[PDB]
Amino acid sequence: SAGAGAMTIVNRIRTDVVNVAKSFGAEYSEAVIDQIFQGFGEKFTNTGFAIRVQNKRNQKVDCNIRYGEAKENCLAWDIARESGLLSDQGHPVDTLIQEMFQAIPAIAYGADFDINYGLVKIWHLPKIVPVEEAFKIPSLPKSVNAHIDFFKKYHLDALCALTVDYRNKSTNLYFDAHHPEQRTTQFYKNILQSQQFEVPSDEVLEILVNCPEIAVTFNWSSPGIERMCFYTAFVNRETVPQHINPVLKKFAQEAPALLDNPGFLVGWSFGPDKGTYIKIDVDYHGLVVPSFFHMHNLPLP
Ligand SMILES: CC(C)=CCSP(=O)(O)OP(=O)(O)O
């Protein structure tokens, strides 16, 4: 029963994470997994936890695990620091999450882990605030401020989260996609073509019009948007658009959850052409999807 029968919730989680990774051919490191769970296993059992797979072009599927909780302080940072998961790089990322929590009150935070790497991100979730609140933050890439006109033009006025990617050396600003123009396929064409990104099929455009959340990625090495992502939730296995892509089908049908019918969150990423790929998270305990609708002032579907 090393991995079966009666077991703690945390051990069930670990076993499920490894099974997913093996099934999708994701790489992982046993030492990294152990290191993550020593620090964070208890959080994973009691809060909004998700397992993600994503399929970047010309590489293996990546398997991530992640959680969030409604605490005002960035509890992940002290945990990751003591676990040895978060070393200073001599870089703006090093102080960025601390600056985010200083500059804007959080109502929640989270952390994200690639099981082949360690801690990849920490999230800051304020209440929805004007995007200009982010310009207070010292270490934000200069590109962010430079996109003020872009944000206004595409109704990216309502900031709903921030993140720091320690691995990629980037930061995402997340927006509440409230504006009725964001219910039209033309919006998505236009925002993508504004950055010279790949425009997806009409089929996919028709899915994007339900997107409540738009992420925009910025970095310190270039003046432009690195990639953007449109997030859409589905309240059960069957409603995921399994026909769009085999990873969506397989994950929807096979992803483990401790709850008997989980929902999913799908991110549709686009970049130059790479940055164009799909991310899918299983709502392992069933907390994440309701919370996603609630945070965007949407009734649950
Ligand atoms: C759970 C929600 C609504 C957003 C999470 S941010 P993310 O993991 O998709 O960020 P990246 O893929 O690292 O850009």
Side-chain angles (χ1 to χ4, degrees):
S1 159
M7 57 182 358
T8 54
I9 304 308
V10 74
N11 280 330
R12 159 51 55 204
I13 294 176
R14 289 177 72 142
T15 290
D16 284 347
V17 162
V18 176
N19 286 344
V20 166
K22 293 208 298 288
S23 174
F24 281 81
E27 287 179 339
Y28 64 91
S29 143
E30 289 86 356
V32 170
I33 290 167
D34 194 57
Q35 188 177 10
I36 292 159
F37 274 84
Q38 294 255 1
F40 288 91
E42 185 150 62
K43 300 297 191 183
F44 294 168
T45 68
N46 290 308
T47 63
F49 172 77
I51 303 175
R52 167 186 282 191
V53 295
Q54 62 181 18
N55 65 1
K56 295 174 173 169
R57 209 207 172 72
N58 303 324
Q59 61 195 79
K60 290 170 200 293
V61 161
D62 297 314
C63 178
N64 281 55
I65 62 185
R66 57 257 307 283
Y67 81 100
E69 66 172 332
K71 297 288 179 198
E72 273 155 21
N73 299 302
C74 190
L75 304 184
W77 187 85
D78 281 337
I79 297 166
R81 294 281 298 182
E82 357 266 64
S83 307
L85 289 162
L86 183 44
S87 290
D88 293 339
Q89 298 177 79
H91 190 277
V93 295
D94 295 347
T95 60
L96 184 57
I97 200 76
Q98 297 95 312
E99 296 172 12
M100 276 173 183
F101 281 79
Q102 282 179 319
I104 308 170
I107 61 170
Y109 79 88
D112 178 31
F113 312 83
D114 176 335
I115 60 176
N116 204 42
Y117 174 86
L119 174 83
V120 174
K121 310 207 292 301
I122 295 175
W123 287 281
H124 179 284
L125 283 87
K127 74 181 167 40
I128 287 169
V129 293
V131 64
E132 292 80 7
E133 287 306 308
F135 305 156
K136 273 180 260 274
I137 294 161
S139 300
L140 268 189
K142 311 311 184 196
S143 57
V144 176
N145 311 73
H147 283 69
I148 286 149
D149 290 339
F150 165 86
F151 298 142
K152 293 170 185 313
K153 176 169 187 183
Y154 291 97
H155 313 300
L156 307 177
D157 61 345
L159 182 80
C160 63
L162 294 161
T163 200
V164 178
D165 188 327
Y166 297 98
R167 177 176 57 187
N168 191 59
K169 296 169 163 172
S170 57
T171 182
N172 295 341
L173 273 59
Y174 301 81
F175 302 88
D176 177 52
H178 59 88
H179 199 284
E181 206 201 344
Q182 299 162 332
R183 309 287 85 78
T184 66
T185 54
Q186 189 67 41
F187 173 91
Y188 294 91
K189 290 196 176 157
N190 286 352
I191 198 173
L192 294 171
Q193 126 198 121
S194 84
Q195 304 304 307
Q196 319 182 225
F197 289 172
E198 278 180 51
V199 167
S201 64
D202 290 342
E203 197 168 16
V204 169
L205 293 166
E206 289 291 352
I207 290 165
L208 301 183
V209 305
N210 293 321
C211 147
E213 193 165 317
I214 296 166
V216 186
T217 304
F218 296 92
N219 68 45
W220 288 265
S221 68
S222 59
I225 292 168
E226 183 179 316
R227 55 188 155 86
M228 68 184 73
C229 186
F230 312 112
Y231 295 89
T232 54
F234 302 95
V235 299
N236 58 38
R237 298 184 186 275
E238 311 102 86
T239 58
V240 169
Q242 295 183 17
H243 65 282
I244 295 294
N245 175 289
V247 176
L248 291 181
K249 181 133 98 78
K250 186 175 180 204
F251 201 72
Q253 284 186 1
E254 303 179 16
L258 236 198
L259 208 56
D260 290 12
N261 203 346
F264 296 78
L265 259 169
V266 178
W268 309 82
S269 188
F270 297 83
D273 186 311
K274 198 264 163 60
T276 297
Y277 59 97
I278 295 163
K279 312 167 197 188
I280 180 169
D281 282 53
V282 65
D283 189 359
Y284 190 84
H285 298 306
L287 302 185
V288 173
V289 168
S291 169
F292 181 72
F293 284 99
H294 186 256
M295 93 178 255
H296 293 285
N297 302 118
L298 287 167
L300 216 215

